[PDB]
A paper describes a structure:
OmpU is a major OMP that constitutes about 30% of the total outer membrane protein when V. cholerae is grown in a medium containing 1% NaCl and nearly 60% when it is grown in salt-free medium. OmpU has long been proposed as a potential virulence factor involved in pathogen–host interactions during infection, being capable of making physical contact with and adhering to host cells, as well as triggering subsequent invasion by the pathogen.
Here, we present the first crystal structure of the V. cholerae OmpU trimer, at a resolution of 2.2 Å. In addition to the ordered water molecules, 13 detergent molecules and six glycerol compounds were manually assigned. A unique structural feature of OmpU is the presence of an extended N-terminal coil (Gly32–Ser42) in the pore lumen in addition to the conventional localization of the constriction loop L3 within the channel, which is unprecedented in solved structures of bacterial porins to the best of our knowledge. Remarkably, L4 is the longest loop on the extracellular side and, instead of being a single long loop, it contains two short antiparallel β-sheets that resemble a β-hairpin structural motif but are connected by a loop containing more than five residues. Although L4 of OmpU is shorter than L4 of OmpK36, L4 of OmpU protrudes further into the extracellular space and projects over L1 of the adjacent protomer to the proximity of L8.
Numbering used by the authors:
A (entry chain B), B (entry chain A), C (entry chain C): 32 to 351
């Protein structure tokens, strides 16, 4: 719930004797304004979740989600835009859950500490693929008392090469190889009983990229505060450092949040944002919002386009 | 309903006190014959409608529709043909309904006066984008007594330009601009009590394009008559003028219709069609039909291909 | 059931008085290992089946199925991969069922004699388009006692040619023609009473391609054996010949299969496979499996890549 931009659970269309199917997703209208110029960023999601009990401590699972968009640019055009965001199957029970296929890595729940806005935020906490969301990957999650644990491992992708090792078509190949894109990620979160305090940390590595994250949060009644720190290498000796702060509170159905994000890549500031929004929940599956991002990049460095502020206006319906 | 080619409403997959989800669409097999040569024009549609009541005079809505086709050309090929026809969210109530995202403009309900065939017709009533269906657009509709009103406004699309004003990548851009494709549309329909007589009119404008339409219809017992006139400019001094006539009758099940369509572009005849069909309704969601279009373009002007007649045969199943 | 890799029936989401809609499909995680190198071959399917009774011996039908995949190659990429596998509508009753749109030809049920593995097999029984699955085709099937009959006919696809006879765009064309890809297929299967013996055979022809198939099987309690032979022409005078053997055994919740596959194209061996697998059914709609294919091609001929063994590991959830 606090991660406002994230998916909500869908609803049952059939069920019987331990086995069910839920359909979910959203229709979200989004208008973006930059320098008084408008862009349509609306999006639809559809998803399907199947779950089958094997016994009282064992079950199977299957999941798909797709995203659909348009880009007319002034004509009634044909729009062939599709993104298969999740494709996996898995097994779970007392020991937790394990899946294969495109699914989330371990660091998402860490970045969730400060990723609480409806449209903006989450600009200074980059995640590498194995830590984020990618296929050819085994993914695990589990909960033991007040400790939550996630982990993932990704295989390098098979390819085909000629005698010298250049990537080529499979018909013209001398042998199989791989792209060296194997990797792993790991994260842990401890909840201190009640009192509202959470702490979390994580690490990830893939090819010549690596990173770690530290985070903490306090939640009390209608108030919330959190902080997050990210540090690693994107390649070479290229350093990345990110800071995020977030605060939010609720008044009736209205939720209000603000974040500060600051990122540094190769010893220059690549992101510097203060953003604010307001979201009104008419119903659990119907909401409206408005958001503004103050861009603090220079404009002598960087440039005019990349230093522009942004206004966003949204209307979101959820299927469930 | 009289507009036979249009969508029918889908059916509920879950509900729970003012909130529902409906799934709909069609599987429509269509064979096209020209000069004794056959083409498969079959199509599938799937759509999802969510609706949530906020109160006795207020609700929210979200909608998506996609269309799916194949084009094998003699091989068992992979077919990645998708069209996202609708993507919008909106709010409605006592005063009517307003939406944002790709949805219909105002002139469709006007062209519906003569658009009554299962396959042919609707060839001499061109609609510009704001009047037809397009994104980055606010759309409104309402009904008050015997008066129906529709309206829409579309924003110009943001783009990025270099110092010289050339459209370029955002990374290579000196500033933001737009494509000048803003516009609007408006239409009204009046019903003369219970007399079966209807009149309608509309207007639309976008960049160097504009148009207006006038229409009238009469319905009595098992008979229907209608006329439609379209006039405007597609650009420069490129004039467009369109005339359509339609008549139909019903006998038990199976419906019979005929239309005449005639269009003139740049002071030359660009469309000239007389068409007849028969459609048999086995069930409300299962029908068959057959249609023939007499092409009356010359062949000395125009050409042999563009002056050919067409036979069409269809079988349509609707999901509900 | 015996054709393990094939679809299972979906489940009802709504129904009323003879008319229903079923949603089905799968989420299937699949890991492929060749030369110690891993490839993600996971896939999702979604399908929608509508059926409406007209009377005690007459009904209508509409069907769609799509397949969805990812190919990240180490990045969190956008994946626009869709395949519309089926798009058809049809009518059926006492005499059987007839459809138009992309659907199956007649020879699939013949290749089903030995196509019983979860992942491998079915490598030496090539089917031409009209016999396989393709659009612009009328398809018929029926069952009368122990006789199953299937047939199909496909039209050539309309195209457009210039004065010189070259395929060109419709605006630049002198006339309509076609690609000469018309054809037909035919097949039959008899069950020899309650003896466990089945015999089947089929034939197909399209443009300059043709083929026939012969098959037989014996099924008794928890044992199964079958054989299949394929012979025809792929073009001009270039020959194709295929041989398949299959065996299977069942123990409680557990299936075990093995197949031998051998094909010859243009008087050279193009396929040579011995494969074995094991599949465990936790629930009717949740299973796991592991499979190994011994590749028997030479390696001096053909090459190293095309002669590699393969290990496969799978986890399959079915939507119903
Ligand atoms: C995200 C804003 C920070 C407020 C955190 C306080 C703890 C409650 O957060 C739950 C997520 O809020 C969902 C908003 O839904 C509004 C429903 O109001 C019910 C409680 O007033
Ligand atoms: C439907 C094409 C126009 C034919 C004239 C119809 C005007 C007469 O009023 C009948 C109105 O019903 C229109 C519905 O048509 C759909 C077919 O439904 C037949 C099932 O009974
Ligand atoms: C499927 C190939 C395995 C060879 C043994 C089958 C011979 C006996 O047939 C018995 C009927 O079962 C056929 C369907 O099996 C599908 C999986 O069912 C497992 C759930 O009980
Ligand atoms: C999977 C290895 C488990 C290591 C976790 C050790 C438990 C105490 C540390 C968890 C709390 C998070 N933090 C930030 C304090 O490290
Ligand atoms: C006391 C200042 C609180 C700053 C954080 C508030 C979050 C942003 C709220 C959006 C603007 C609405 N407002 C002004 C009522 O807070
Ligand atoms: C709590 C937010 C902390 C953000 C402060 C981090 C400052 C980054 C310093 C980099 C300055 C850029 N440079 C290269 C000119 O030094
Ligand atoms: C929690 C502190 C956040 C403060 C937000 C202040 C926004 C700064 C905008 C600058 C414009 C103000 N002014 C007066 C210069 O126009
Ligand atoms: C009174 C007949 C004059 C035509 C009426 C207009 C409807 C034409 C429908 C075409 C159907 C062909 N049919 C069966 C009527 O001959
Ligand atoms: C029932 C409506 C009939 C509309 C037909 C209009 C005919 C105009 C086309 C004539 C040829 C154009 N022009 C002006 C060059 O002669
Ligand atoms: C009430 C009759 C309307 C239903 C029309 C159904 C037509 C079936 C198609 C038959 C094809 C005949 N044809 C075109 C080959 O001559
Ligand atoms: C043209 C030959 C007629 C078809 C042969 C009929 C098959 C024999 C009938 C066996 C009946 C079996 N069963 C289970 C379907 O009832
Ligand atoms: C023909 C299928 C395999 C069993 C062979 C039995 C021979 C009977 C052939 C006559 C029936 C032909 N058929 C089924 C197309 O009607
Ligand atoms: C008792 C015979 C059972 C044969 C089936 C064995 C399947 C191999 C195990 C694959 C499952 C891998 N994993 C971890 C995803 O479950």
């Amino acid at each position: 719930g606090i991660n406002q931009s994230g998916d909500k659970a869908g609803s049952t269309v059939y069920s019987a004797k331990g086995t069910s199917l839920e359909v979910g997703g959203r229709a979200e209208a989004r208008l973006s304004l930059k320098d008084g110029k408008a862009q349509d960023n609306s999006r639809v999601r559809l998803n399907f979740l199947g779950k089958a009990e094997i016994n009282d401590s064992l079950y199977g699972v299957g999941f798909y989600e797709g995203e659909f968009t348009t880009n007319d640019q002034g004509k009634n055009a044909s729009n062939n835009s599709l993104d298969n965001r999740y494709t996996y199957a898995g097994i779970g029970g007392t020991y937790g859950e394990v899946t294969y296929g495109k699914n989330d890595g371990a660091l998402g729940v860490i970045t969730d500490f400060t990723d609480i806005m409806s449209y903006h935020g989450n600009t200074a906490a980059e995640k590498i693929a194995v830590a984020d969301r990618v296929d050819n990957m085994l993914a695990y999650k589990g909960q033991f008392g007040d400790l939550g644990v996630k982990a993932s491992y990704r295989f390098a992708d098979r390819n085909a090469v000629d005698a010298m090792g250049n990537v080529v078509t499979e018909t013209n190949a001398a042998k199989y190889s791989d792209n060296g894109e194997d990797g792993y990620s790991l994260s842990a979160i401890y909840t201190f009983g009640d009192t509202g305090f959470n702490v979390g940390a994580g690490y990830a590595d893939q090819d010549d990229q690596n990173e770690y994250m530290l985070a903490a949060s306090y939640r009390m009644e209608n108030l919330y505060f959190a902080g997050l720190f990210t540090d690693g290498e994107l390649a070479k000796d290229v350093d990345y450092t990110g800071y995020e702060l977030a605060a939010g509170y609720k008044l009736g159905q209205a939720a209000f949040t603000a974040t500060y994000n600051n990122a540094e890549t190769a010893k220059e500031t690549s992101a510097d944002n203060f953003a604010i929004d307001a979201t009104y929940y008419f119903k659990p599956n119907f909401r409206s919002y408005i958001s503004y991002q103050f861009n603090l990049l220079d404009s002598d460095k960087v440039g005019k386009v990349a230093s522009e502020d942004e206004l966003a206006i949204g209307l979101r319906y959820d299927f469930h």
